[PDB]
Design an enzyme around this catalytic site. Sequence first.
Site: not given
Length: 279
Positions: A16, A39, A69, A175, A177, A224, A260
């Site tokens: 936290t 990818d 990547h 929207p 996903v 990514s 946060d």
Amino acid sequence: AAQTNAPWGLARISSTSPGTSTYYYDESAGQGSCVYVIDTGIEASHPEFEGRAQMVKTYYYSSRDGNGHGTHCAGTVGSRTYGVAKKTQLFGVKVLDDNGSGQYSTIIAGMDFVASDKNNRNCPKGVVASLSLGGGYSSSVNSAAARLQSSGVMVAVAAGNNNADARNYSPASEPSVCTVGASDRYDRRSSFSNYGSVLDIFGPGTDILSTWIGGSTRSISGTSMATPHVAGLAAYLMTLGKTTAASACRYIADTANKGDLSNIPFGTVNLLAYNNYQA
């Protein structure tokens, strides 16, 4: 279980507060779940994958990751040292060439491939797909991501690295996903991270150490890198029975650390992925 001296992003998703160095997680570690990494490929022979990674499809001359990547992203999902879900099964789908680029028609084919291929695999705890890619808005790319989600796969996608509203990028703007922004080790929005109302969740994205090709490691930055933190977290939570593929993005948002992060523009969620682990 606890991993001491963990990469900061793993420590951050089990705390936290920023600034800790231990990653706390349940020993089940995503066992019995499956994550497709769509990818540049995966160097499946890397010792960090322990035999748990496999290339299943390529759209180019070879299935090898000649870029790095995809191997980096897969390592953040499920490598032994650098991964969120250290016992998950990884499947590689190579839709990007060794320069890191790919046509939209190929990316769409790779998504439709996963929606079918998962029916041939033994993944009793569920199926996740991690998409650390994107480009300009395309309704066809958005539609393919929605189909993959509808077929029963938890889809996590990168918000993009343009410091702009993600509404103009795909598949970030779909929207249905889970669209993932990036944060840094001081709980700031990463300076490159896209933002906007389509974002669902933030994960660690700046200076992320993970696996690389040639049996190596390196640190790189991007949305990514945040996306596989969330994909691995979903696999981990599905194995624990806390959520399903259809509701994992909402559950992750519901249980996130809230408020946060700094440098979040008005209208973007202030939510950082969190595993809520209790010893």
